[PDB]
Design a protein around this nucleic acid. Structure first.
Lengths: 61, 102, 35, 148, 95
RNA sequence: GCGUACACGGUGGAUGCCCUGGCAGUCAGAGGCGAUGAAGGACGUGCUAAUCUGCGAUAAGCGUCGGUAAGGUGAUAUGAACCGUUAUAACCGGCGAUUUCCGAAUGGGGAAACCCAGUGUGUUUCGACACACUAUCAUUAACUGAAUCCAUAGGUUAAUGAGGCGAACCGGGGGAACUGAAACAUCUAAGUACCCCGAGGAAAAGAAAUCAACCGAGAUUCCCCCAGUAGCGGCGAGCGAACGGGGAGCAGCCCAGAGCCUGAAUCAGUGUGUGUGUUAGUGGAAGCGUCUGGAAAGGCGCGCGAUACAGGGUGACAGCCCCGUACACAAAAAUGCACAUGCUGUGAGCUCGAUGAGUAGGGCGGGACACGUGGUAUCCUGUCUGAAUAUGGGGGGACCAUCCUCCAAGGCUAAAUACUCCUGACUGACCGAUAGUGAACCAGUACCGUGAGGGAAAGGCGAAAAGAACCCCGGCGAGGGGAGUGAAAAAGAACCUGAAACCGUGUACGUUUAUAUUCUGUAGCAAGGUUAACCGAAUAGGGGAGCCGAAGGGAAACCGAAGUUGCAGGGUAU
């Protein structure tokens, strides 16, 4: 998890992080507004993943 | 490290449970321990129509300090102290009073 | 708008007295130094 | 006066003014008051010498002072000191000697009822606190030369 | 046997409720409540509530024969001040 | 209708238990931070109604390396929902990335958390998004550069200082009224508060042209005595020295120009390895039975460990309940303290020379010099004049003689030293919510004054919420009663123990520390004692520059005395 995505090229990291922040964030916010997503650890894991992927692309390259 | 952890057999030295043995289920962050069938309480829980209310008075277990319960070993049948030692590649707890191996 | 003109934070800071009074006010620790 | 070493049947002679001088209650009271106050008050060497001589003489007359040729433990273990004290039936005693012994000091460290201190660091409070005092001939002569 | 019924922190003047209760002091509970039914005083409602609660407690826990129940010890005490509040107490038994 | 006393009540907190609180000290670092945006705020970030704390749209966090790792996901303060459980759950530490807006706040405006922008680059699209820059003063360097050829003023660029705050110390320049002589003159208050500058954490100064004079001490820096002596003041209140004499430390300097032999020790910067700390942690001793008691940690009996009976708490008082302590160990990477270690610049010692020349001094005009030249003074002016130089000067009682100093107009010198806004640890013949901090509590909060400023009161359920399930009355409320938990509910969330004052019922009856002076006792020694400051694994012991008595008295012709220092006690002088 922490190191599985480290070796991948920057292009796929950019693609996955942009797709996640564009789709999963909207899905989770709409679910929370509508009362869905009874389990909240999805928010934690997705926020941590997006933060970790965005932490790269600045010091790595 | 904690001298008492999961899957450990203990006997309550005092507190209305003298001489009775049990297995520790969970330990609270404040130092409390949970052992099945040593201290049963009569919590007057408030009935609620949702959340699958158990019904009536719930006979659950309360939380008691770890200090009030000692560790039990089957080698001699009497509670004894425990220290920590270094094994070939790890550190493990070893009882006292002839150093029974866990 | 008179309150902003008179007791405005920038207006007070424009003078040395404003800086010293706000510094000692913070030293005291009031939640609102001026308003 | 003359004292018995109780270990070799050897009699040792000491200055009369030290172990044979009259007990001055006022001097001892003043010294203990000054010690408690300091625990700023003027302190004089002559006052200290008089107080120590008076208390030593009183203890000798009360048979509260007993001397040995040497007091030590072969190994730095408190059990050795405890058993040695039990052999003589001594529980509340003040061990006083000259050069500090590492083994004896280590053994007596935990013992609340037994205290170990150097000859130069002797104070009346330690002498009065414990029922009896165990010293050594070397310590006795060291104290005698200190008091002159 | 004895029956107790009391109300805490009643928002009424203590002296007024004491005077109202003095009217029914030393009187049968049934007669007291019958007389208090038509009473127009504000404390009339409070005394009616306390007496009905007393008889309800008696019949639920104590024995029967609540009609012969008698008023024994009725009083009011001054309460905390925030119009001073009052505490009403009624002890009733047939004997 | 009331009173004489008792029991129950309610606003009620005298008393007592301490605390997640303050206050006074001791030992150490730090003794400043930042344009690479200091300090502090505004708003957000939890499954959130709210708070502390962390963080900043990558938001109660992320990448790396170590310790631990089976419970944790921070708590208040529960619930829902999660991962993994022997190394990719979670926690601590170092190294890195981000870090919204205001805030010196720095692109401009402006009303603090607000608005409006421009330039260049990337955009795999050029709607629009991300990044860097875009203020002022001063200095250095480079390129351009009018009057005026060059050079300057001016312009562009690279670099450096400052945009502010911070408790105290240092020097310099000004600086008050209150002030005692019952007011007041010379004065004290006071050079205190206050205003400014410089930058140091310590500062300045720091090594004699020093004082007496015919003997003498020899850097600067602080300290008790001399000493409240002289001296100063309607000699009254009051102020107030040293030459000189002892402790901390005592290191001096250099170049000031010429060379000789020279990269000969030292300095600042930069690698290597050694040892100890900072920066997560590891191990680490030992007990039962009866009785009592809600529960033992109360005590009775016999045991074990103790380098550890320091301490914390655990149903009442614990060495053997544990956490801990003594003690022995521990760092992947970062970091201070001293070493041998390679290198870049300074760079040893020897001899020969001057001794910092418009300089000392002098003339006409002030400053504060208690005193306006009067009994009268120091750095100098606006300007001029004007010394031999070490063989000479300052000079010293001026002098002859004799004596100290400099070798005359460069500054450097950490040492012994004042203080804590803040950081780390320890202690309290210090206090206990009307005390202690204003604030032990969501306290510099509420609140008041449109600002300065002032400023509160408000804590204790139960060891364990295990919070009175349930049933009934009641209005589906509030409130109460049975039952039950709970040691106790004469412990019930309006919850620590709980006296009355006030009001009702029934019961028996009638209607100022501190500086001196004197006297008291007591204790050492003795013509002696105390030693000051300081040293001192430390009130031990040393250490009398320093105080008085003193085989002395007396007229140094002559004859031949027992006082001091501590303790407690009192009166007096402010």
């Amino acid at each position: 998890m922490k190191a599985k995505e480290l070796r991948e090229k920057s292009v796929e990291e950019l693609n996955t992080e942009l797709l996640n922040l564009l789709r999963e964030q909207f899905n989770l916010r709409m679910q929370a507004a509508s009362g869905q997503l009874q389990q909240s650890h999805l928010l934690k894991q997705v926020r941590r993943d997006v933060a970790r992927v965005k932490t790269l692309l600045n010091e790595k390259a | 490290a904690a001298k008492i952890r999961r899957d450990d057999e203990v006997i309550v030295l005092t507190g209305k449970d003298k001489g009775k043995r049990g297995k520790v289920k969970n330990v609270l962050s404040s130092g409390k321990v949970i052992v099945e069938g040593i201290n049963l309480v009569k919590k007057h829980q408030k009935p609620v129509p949702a959340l699958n209310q158990p019904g009536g008075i719930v006979e659950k277990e309360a939380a008691i300090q770890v200090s009030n319960v000692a560790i039990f070993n089957a080698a001699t049948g009497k509670a004894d102290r425990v220290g920590f030692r270094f094994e070939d590649g790890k550190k493990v707890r070893f009882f006292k009073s002839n150093s029974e191996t866990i | 708008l008179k309150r902003n003109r008179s007791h405005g934070f920038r207006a007070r800071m424009a003078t040395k007295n404003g800086r010293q009074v706000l510094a000692r006010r913070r030293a005291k620790g009031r939640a609102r130094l001026t308003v | 006066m003359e004292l018995v070493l109780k270990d070799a049947q050897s009699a040792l002679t000491v200055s009369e003014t030290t172990f044979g001088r009259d007990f001055n209650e006022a001097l001892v009271h003043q010294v203990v008051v000054a010690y408690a106050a300091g625990a700023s008050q003027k302190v004089n060497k002559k006052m200290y010498r008089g107080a120590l001589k008076s208390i030593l003489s009183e203890l000798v007359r009360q048979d509260r002072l007993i001397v040995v040729e040497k007091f030590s433990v072969e190994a730095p273990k408190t059990k050795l000191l405890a058993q040695k004290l039990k052999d003589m039936a001594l529980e509340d005693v003040l061990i006083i000697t000259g050069e500090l012994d590492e083994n004896l000091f280590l053994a007596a460290r935990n013992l609340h009822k037994v205290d170990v201190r150097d000859a130069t660091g002797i104070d009346p409070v330690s002498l009065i606190a414990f029922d009896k005092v165990v010293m050594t001939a070397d310590a006795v002569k060291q104290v005698e030369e200190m008091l002159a | 046997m004895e029956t107790i019924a009391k109300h805490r922190h009643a928002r009424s003047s203590a002296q007024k409720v004491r005077l109202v209760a003095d009217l029914i002091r030393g009187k049968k509970v049934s007669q007291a409540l019958d007389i208090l039914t038509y009473t127009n005083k504000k404390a009339a409602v409070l005394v009616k509530k306390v007496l009905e609660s007393a008889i309800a407690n008696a019949e639920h826990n104590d024995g029967a024969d609540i009609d012969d129940l008698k008023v024994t010890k009725i009083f009011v005490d001054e309460g905390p001040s925030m119009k001073r509040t009052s505490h009403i107490t009624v002890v009733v038994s047939d004997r």
